[PDB]
RNA sequence: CCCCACUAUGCUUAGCCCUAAACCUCAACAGUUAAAUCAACAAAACUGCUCGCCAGAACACUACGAGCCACAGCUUAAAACUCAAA
């Protein structure tokens, strides 16, 4: 009346910071174009970008925790987990669509590895 | 800093290490056992466990610095102090023979003391509490007029009246001028120590 | 909470995976070790994480799991100690014993135990003021004529000040082909790197890049560098210096053959003169340069 | 009144500060109070009073030495409720509030300038 | 309020006046220390017996009447109106 009278779970790559890359956390994308001398870390960064946002969009609210984006030669494995709620017929259809459109995508042999979890693995809580 | 607070200053003086065992006391024992488990940083550039070594001197050579030109600011003091030496060695062969054994002929004790005869006890600290600078005797500690000595010396030998007399040898005539109690970095600790006294009224404000 | 059986299948777990380990590396799984475990699961799945926690890890379930309880009575519900409605028996129990063996001797480097391990060792909490008066009991068994049962059982509640910095590395003594003995040593400051040779015997030369030190010196500050370590332990012209310095500048230069020299002089000097060498700051690197 | 359970249980500023510096100077004058602070021979340098009378705060002249002072200052801690209950008791003041004992600093300065001005060298008869 | 001066008064004699936080805020005598000692605080809790006094607050140490060496005095001492408290 009167103005006097007035006056979260998360996971492993969630729960630890940042600072914690090279202690706690790792790289989830492992390439050599970072390295010294080596080249064509940008060309490889925009792959792991599109390759994060196509395999979210073509797996939604099915992968668990993030990507895992491998290269050893041409090779491009994406070690994904996801949740066991999608049908599995309906992964496989999924993970040959997605190998396929990736391979001829980029010109080089990509991979899957999709890894089902019952649930998120909770870390802690913040 | 890059030292870590463990990291603890060295003591270069040589003859304390070898000092027996046997005068060592419990405490000196004691700080003796602690600093083993200490980590020491590394001695600087500069002071050395020399016998010639002398820190008021380096203090003065480290104050005459410019730019971080240490070669020429030792330079001009080993200079001034072979211009003292040999005026004082002129004046000596000079001398009569009664008036030989009051001739000092060191270099060293000439610097020292004529630093000593400069250095002032009291100074003033500039106060303003009621809208005024007031100006209030304070005793002066003693790094604070060891420093304000060798400062005075300094700046007294950068006058630019003294028109193109090298350092060296103005140094060593105001040297040779404050160890016989005369000269005009006396007169400044004199007219310090009367400005101070003309104000023994105003020490009620500390 | 981790219940009995989880632990008990978790061993089971363990047993297997150790065996399982052992076939895979081809060692027998008879005599596989958990340091042989902890070797091949660095090798298996390597990890550059610094904290070492944070690596692949897989220990006895004994040492993962925090999981405990004991039980202080019986069925009949009688407790097994005579101390036990004190709610301490543990700490009491240790203090009655303290006080037993003061009167026996009455008739007749290290630290002492920090608060938290003392209650990890009696699984007892217990209180700042507690451990103040049996910290005074052990001092007091201290001061009396301890014998061996009386020390060893001080000894369990001492641990050991692992922090002792006299830890200089002394160069071994090496041979030249004319028999000479020599230790060589390195050094840096700033950008400037110094490698010496310091004999055992000489007349005091020190050549530097194979020029005499007096004239790759020519200021008196790097000839009076390059003597502070000589003369700190008095034995000015009783050896002969080699050295090969690069980069930096003169100081730099100075500074790195001063600490190169002491390092190899810690060969041929007592231990108590490597530590007052150490004390006075001629053995440890400068870690101070330019900053961005 | 059964002591027993008891014990077990501005201008006007300004002349009040005066007769109250004249009343404990005259206390302090004799053994009226105690022999221990007589002997003593404390000496005191103002007397004032707080705004609202809660406290009396009687500033005494301090010694160079360390131990007298601080032989001094627990004198007169503990004598002074008796020199409170004597002034009430001689009818200096209807009321006194508590007095507390504080050492006065700046007269130690002038002790030391004074000791450092008499063995200065000032110069030429200047 | 502080300083100075000075009265009634504080003193004696002979009469009055009859009030106080005139209070140990405990009525006088006799007795007990056993019971749950005992609202609280004050000052440990009670018993027998007797006199005096009290029955919501305020109006009210008041009005009127009466008595008094008192005359702006003292003792005794109400009612009306009002309130749900005190
Ligand atoms: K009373
Ligand atoms: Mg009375
Ligand atoms: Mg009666
Ligand atoms: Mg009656
Ligand atoms: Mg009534
Ligand atoms: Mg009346």
């Not at chain 2, 463990?6 to 060592?24: A, G, H, Q, S, T």
């Not at chain 3, 405990?68 to 009491?92: M, N």
């Not at chain 4, 002038?110 to 063995?119: I, K």
């Given at each position: 009346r009167e103005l006097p009278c007035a006056w979260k779970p998360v996971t492993y790559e969630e729960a630890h910071a940042?600072?914690?890359?090279?202690?706690?956390?790792?790289?989830?994308?492992?390439?050599?174009?970072?390295?010294?001398?080596?080249?064509?870390?940008?060309?490889?960064?925009?792959?792991?970008?599109?390759?994060?946002?196509?395999?979210?969009?073509?797996?939604?609210?099915?992968?668990?925790?993030?990507?895992?984006?491998?290269?050893?030669?041409?090779?491009?494995?994406?070690?994904?987990?996801?949740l066991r709620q999608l049908s599995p017929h309906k992964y496989y259809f999924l993970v040959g669509y997605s190998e396929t459109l990736l391979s001829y995508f980029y010109k080089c042999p990509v991979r899957l590895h999709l890894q089902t979890v019952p649930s998120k693995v909770v870390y802690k809580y913040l | 800093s890059r030292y870590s607070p463990?990291?603890?200053?060295?003591?270069?003086?040589?003859?304390?290490?070898?000092?027996?065992?046997?005068?060592?006391?419990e405490e000196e024992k004691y700080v003796r056992?602690?600093?083993?488990?200490?980590?020491?940083?590394?001695?600087?550039?500069?002071?050395?466990?020399?016998?010639?070594?002398?820190?008021?001197?380096?203090?003065?050579?480290?104050?005459?610095?410019?730019?971080?030109?240490?070669?020429?600011?030792?330079?001009?003091?080993?200079?001034?102090?072979?211009?003292?030496?040999?005026?004082?060695?002129?004046?000596y062969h000079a001398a009569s023979a009664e008036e030989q054994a009051t001739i000092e002929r060191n270099p060293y004790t000439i610097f020292h003391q004529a630093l000593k005869n400069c250095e002032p006890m009291i100074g003033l600290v500039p106060i303003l509490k009621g809208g005024r600078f007031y100006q209030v005797p304070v005793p002066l500690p003693d790094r604070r007029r060891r420093f304000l000595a060798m400062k005075w010396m300094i700046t007294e030998c950068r006058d630019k009246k003294h028109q193109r007399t090298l350092m060296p040898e103005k140094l060593s005539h105001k040297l040779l001028e404050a160890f016989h109690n005369q000269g005009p970095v006396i007169k400044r600790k004199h007219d310090l120590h009367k400005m101070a006294e003309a104000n023994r009224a105003l020490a009620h404000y500390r | 909470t981790y219940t009995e059986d989880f632990i008990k299948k978790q061993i089971e777990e363990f047993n297997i995976g150790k065996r399982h380990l052992a076939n895979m590396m081809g060692e027998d799984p008879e005599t596989f070790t958990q340091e042989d475990i902890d070797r091949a699961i660095a090798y298996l799945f390597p990890s550059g994480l610094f904290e070492k926690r944070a690596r692949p890890v897989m220990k006895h379930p004994e040492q993962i799991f925090?999981?405990?309880?004991?039980?202080?009575?019986?069925?009949?519900?009688?407790?097994?100690?005579?101390?036990?409605?004190?709610?301490?028996?543990?700490?009491?129990?240790?203090?009655?014993?303290?006080?037993?063996?003061?009167?026996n001797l009455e008739k007749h480097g290290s630290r002492w135990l920090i608060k938290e391990e003392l209650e990890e060792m009696l699984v007892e909490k217990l209180s700042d003021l507690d451990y103040m008066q049996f910290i005074?009991?052990?001092?007091?068994?201290?001061?009396?004529?301890?014998?061996?049962?009386?020390?060893?059982?001080?000894?369990?509640?001492?641990?050991?000040?692992?922090?002792?910095?006299?830890?200089?590395?002394?160069?071994?003594?090496?041979?030249?082909?004319?028999?000479?003995?020599?230790?060589?040593?390195?050094g840096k400051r700033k950008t400037a790197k110094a490698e010496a040779i310091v004999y055992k015997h000489g007349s005091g030369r020190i050549k530097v890049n194979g020029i005499d030190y007096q004239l790759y010196f020519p200021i008196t500050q790097d000839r009076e560098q390059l003597m502070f370590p000589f003369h700190f332990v008095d034995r000015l012209g009783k050896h002969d210096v080699t050295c090969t310095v690069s980069g930096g500048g003169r100081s730099a230069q100075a500074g790195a053959i001063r600490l190169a020299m002491a390092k190899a002089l810690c060969s041929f000097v007592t231990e108590d003169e490597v530590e007052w060498m150490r004390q006075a700051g001629l053995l440890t690197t400068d870690p101070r340069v330019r900053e961005r | 009144?059964?002591?027993?359970?008891?014990?077990?249980?501005?201008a006007r500023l300004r002349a009040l500060n005066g007769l109250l510096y004249k009343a404990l100077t005259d206390l302090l004058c004799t053994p009226e109070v105690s022999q221990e602070l007589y002997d003593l021979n404390v000496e005191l340098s103002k007397v004032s009073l707080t705004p609202d009378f809660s406290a009396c705060r009687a500033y005494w002249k301090t010694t160079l030495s360390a131990e007298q002072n601080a032989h001094m200052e627990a004198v007169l801690q503990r004598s002074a409720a008796h020199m409170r209950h004597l002034l009430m008791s001689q009818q200096t003041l209807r009321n006194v509030p508590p007095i507390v004992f504080v050492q006065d600093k700046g007269n130690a300065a002038?002790?030391?300038?004074?000791?450092?001005?008499?063995?200065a060298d000032f110069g030429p008869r200047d």
């Open positions: 940042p600072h914690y890359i090279a202690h706690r956390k790792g790289w989830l994308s492992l390439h050599t174009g970072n390295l010294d001398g080596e080249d064509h870390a940008a060309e490889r960064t925009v792959e792991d970008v599109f390759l994060r946002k196509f395999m979210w969009g073509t797996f939604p609210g099915c992968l668990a925790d993030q990507l895992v984006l491998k290269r050893r030669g041409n090779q491009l494995e994406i070690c994904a987990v996801v | 463990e990291f603890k200053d060295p003591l270069i003086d040589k003859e304390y290490y070898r000092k027996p065992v046997e005068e060592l006391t056992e602690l600093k083993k488990t200490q980590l020491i940083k590394a001695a600087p550039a500069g002071k050395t466990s020399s016998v010639f070594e002398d820190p008021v001197i380096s203090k003065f050579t480290n104050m005459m610095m410019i730019g971080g030109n240490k070669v020429l600011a030792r330079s001009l003091m080993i200079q001034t102090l072979e211009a003292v030496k040999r005026k004082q060695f002129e004046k | 925090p999981r405990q309880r004991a039980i202080q009575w019986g069925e009949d519900g009688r407790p097994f100690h005579y101390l036990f409605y004190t709610g301490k028996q543990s700490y009491y129990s240790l203090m009655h014993d303290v006080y037993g063996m003061l009167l005074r009991l052990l001092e007091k068994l201290l001061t009396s004529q301890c014998g061996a049962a009386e020390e060893e059982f001080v000894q369990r509640f001492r641990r050991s000040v692992t922090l002792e910095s006299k830890k200089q590395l002394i160069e071994p003594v090496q041979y030249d082909e004319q028999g000479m003995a020599f230790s060589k040593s390195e | 009144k059964n002591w027993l359970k008891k014990f077990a249980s501005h002038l002790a030391e300038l004074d000791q450092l001005l008499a063995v």
